[PDB]
Design a protein around this ligand. Sequence first.
Ligand SMILES: CC(C)(COP(=O)(O)O)[C@@H](O)C(=O)NCCC(=O)NCCSC(=O)[C@]1(C)CCC[C@@]2(C)[C@@H]3[C@@H]4C[C@@H]5C[C@]3(C[C@]5(C)O4)[C@H](O)C[C@@H]21
Ligand SMILES: [Mn+2]
Ligand SMILES: [Mn+2]
Ligand SMILES: [Mn+2]
Ligand SMILES: [Mn+2]
Ligand SMILES: [Mn+2]
Ligand SMILES: [Mn+2]
Ligand SMILES: [Mn+2]
Lengths: 356, 356
Amino acid sequence: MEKLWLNSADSHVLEPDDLWERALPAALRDRAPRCVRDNGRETVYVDGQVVRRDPLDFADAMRPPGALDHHIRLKDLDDQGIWGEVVFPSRGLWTAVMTDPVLARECIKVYNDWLKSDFLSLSPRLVGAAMVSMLDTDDAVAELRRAADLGYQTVFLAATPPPGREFNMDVWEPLWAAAEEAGMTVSIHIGTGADTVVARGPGGAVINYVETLFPAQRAVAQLVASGALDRHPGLRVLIAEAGCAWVPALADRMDEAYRQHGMFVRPKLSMLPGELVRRQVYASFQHDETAIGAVTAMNYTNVLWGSDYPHLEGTFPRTQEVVTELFAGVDPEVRDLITRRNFTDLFTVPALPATV
Amino acid sequence: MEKLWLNSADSHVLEPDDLWERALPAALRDRAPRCVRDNGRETVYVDGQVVRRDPLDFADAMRPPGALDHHIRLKDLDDQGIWGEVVFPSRGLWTAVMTDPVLARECIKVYNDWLKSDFLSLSPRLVGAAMVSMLDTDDAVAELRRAADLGYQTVFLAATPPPGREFNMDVWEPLWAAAEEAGMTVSIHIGTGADTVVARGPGGAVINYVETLFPAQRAVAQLVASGALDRHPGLRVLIAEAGCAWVPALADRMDEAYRQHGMFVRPKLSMLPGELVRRQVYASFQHDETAIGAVTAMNYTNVLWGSDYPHLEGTFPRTQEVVTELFAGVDPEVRDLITRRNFTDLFTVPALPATV
Ligand SMILES: CC(C)(COP(=O)(O)O)[C@@H](O)C(=O)NCCC(=O)NCCSC(=O)[C@]1(C)CCC[C@@]2(C)[C@@H]3[C@@H]4C[C@@H]5C[C@]3(C[C@]5(C)O4)[C@H](O)C[C@@H]21
Ligand SMILES: [Mn+2]
Ligand SMILES: [Mn+2]
Ligand SMILES: [Mn+2]
Ligand SMILES: [Mn+2]
Ligand SMILES: [Mn+2]
Ligand SMILES: [Mn+2]
Ligand SMILES: [Mn+2]
C-alpha cells in the first residue's frame, strides 16, 4: 500500500538449460556448464569436471517462480518497487573456472548474444553484465569492445582470477584501457572463479559466507595498490554482493601501509589508496545496516543497494520492508544516494516517472 | 593536561638474543629461534627452517633503544603520553610456526617466565600477553593456568592456527573454558602463524598488509559461527593490529548468512552473530579514522587504540600528533572509550585520576 522506488545493483538470470548445447559446435557443445538438480542436490558439470555438488533444501529453500519464468520476474520488479536492475549470469559464472580459453571465449559470446536478444529485450529497466574471458586478454578486450557496440554498460569479472592472472598483473592493462575508453563499469561479483577456501567444520554455512569476502578485498587491494585505477581515472569498479563497510576499512589499511611501509612500496601512486577507493570503487549490499554508516561516518559515498534476486541472501519478497527498516530515521539524501543515484551514475535506464 | 593520556592495546618487546640459548634443555637449544646478521640481512632460523629474511634497515627500524632497554621503554611511554601498554612477543611469535609440540611448549615456558620476571616486573603500566601452545590443547591449557597463577591477564594466539586446528574445531573447547574460568582475555595478533609475504607483484607491500586481515576475519567468523563465544559469555577476544571497521561489516555478513541461510546453519546460536561480536570481540588500530566511525555509526563500541610500539605501522614517535588529529572535534566520551576505557575493561593497570 506504500512503497518507495529503488534501483538494484545486483540480481541473477537463469539461462536456458540448452543455451550452449543448441548454439555451440560439436567440439565445444558437450563441455559447457550443465546444472542438474536431482535428489536434494545441485551438481554442476564444466568441461568434464564436477565443479559443484551442493545440498538443496527441497522444503525451506524453494526458488522464486520468477527465477523460472521471466514474465513473473518483471511482475516481481514492480511488486518489490525496483525500477532499474543489474543482471548477472548464473550458469554463465562457471566460464570463470574454465581452463580452455577456446571453450571460455565461445561460451561467453553465446551468453552475451542470448542475454541481449531474449532477456534484456523484455525491458530496458534490465541492465545486463557482459562476460569477458578471464583467461586471455586479447579475447577479453575483443568481447568488451563487441559488447560495448551491442550497448552493454558493464562487464562481469570473477572475484578469483585464474592462477598468474591476479588483478595486479600487467596482463590486464589492455582491458583496463579498453573499459575506460568504452566507459564500461567493471563489475566483480563475489563467489566466482576457482574455489579458494571451503569450511567443513562447525559453523560452516556462516564461515563459507565470510570466506567469499576475501577474494573481493584482495581484488580491491590489487587494483588500487598496482596503480590500475590510478592510471585509468575514468575506470569505475563495482564489487557486487560483498557488503560495503569493509571498503573504507581497507582504504585506511592500504593508506597505513602506503605511508608507514613506503620504502617497500612500488609502484608509487599519484594519490593515496583511500582517495582512489573513494573515487572509483563502488560496492553493493542487500541487508547490511553498516553500509549506511560507511556513507554517513566514513566519507565512502559509493554504496549501492542490490536485491540479489532470486538468491536466498537477497531481499525478495520483503524488499520494501527491509529498505524501510534500513533507512528509518536516515537522511533522505543518503537513502536517495544509496538506492537510486549511485545506480544512475554507473548505469542508464529509462527515466523513472515521478509520483507527484 | 599538555598531553592526551592514552592506553596502548598493542606493542612488542624484543627478546634477549640469548633468551632460549641459556634457559632451554641442551637437546632443544639449537632448534629455538636464532638469527644470523650478515651482508645487510638478518635471517631467522626455527627448528631447521629459514622463517624470515629482512634487510637490516627494516629489522633495526623496529628496534629503537626502548624496544630493547625496558627502562628507556618506560621513558618513551611518558614521552608519547601513553600510560598502560599490552606487550606482545617479537621472536616468540615464531613458536606459532613450530611443528614440534615439545619445542613449542618449552620455548613458550621460557618466554612467559622471562617476560614476567625480567620485563613486567619493572612497572604495573605493562600488561604482558602469555604465549600458549598453538599445537596441543592440554599444553595450552596447562600453560594458561600456570600463567594466570603468575598473574597474567591475556594469552596470545596466532591468527593462522596450525592445519586441522582451525578456531571452529572442538579441540579448542578446553582452552575457551580455561580462559573464561581465569578471566583471561584471548589476544589474537595478526600476521602470526603463517608467512606474511603472499603477494610479490606490483603493489606487493600494500597487498600483503591487506592479506594479514584475512586470517583475523576468518578467526572471528570461526569463533562466532562455531558457538565458542556463545558457550563462553565471559570470554573476550582482542583482535590486535587488524583495524576495526571490518568488524561491524563482518557482524552484518554473518547475520545475513544466519537469517537467510538458516536451513544450512549448525550450530544454532543463542543470539545473532552480530550480538556476539558487539558483546565479546574487541579490535585495535593505530591510525585508522574509520575506527571512530565504527563506534559512532555502526554501534561497535569495542574499538581500542594501540601504538604498536615500535613497528613502522605504529604511531611512535608521533603518538600525540596522530591521536590529536584523529580525535579533533570528536565527542570526548568516544575519545575516552577508544583511548582509555575499553583498555581498562580488558586489562588492570593503576587508574589515572580521570580528574584530567
Ligand atoms: C615488497 C615485498 C612484496 C617483496 O616483493 P619482491 O619479492 O621484492 O617483489 C615484501 O618484502 C613485502 O611485502 N614487504 C613489506 C614488509 C612485509 O614483510 N610485509 C608483510 C605484511 S605486514 C606484516 O606481516 C606485519 C603484521 C606488520 C609488519 C611487521 C611484521 C612483518 C613483523 C616483523 C618481522 C617479523 C614478522 C612479523 C614479526 C616479526 C618478528 O617482526 C609479523 O609476523 C608480521 C608483521
Ligand atoms: Mn548477486
Ligand atoms: Mn547471491
Ligand atoms: Mn532472502
Ligand atoms: Mn651471542
Ligand atoms: Mn602489534
Ligand atoms: Mn605491527
Ligand atoms: Mn610509523
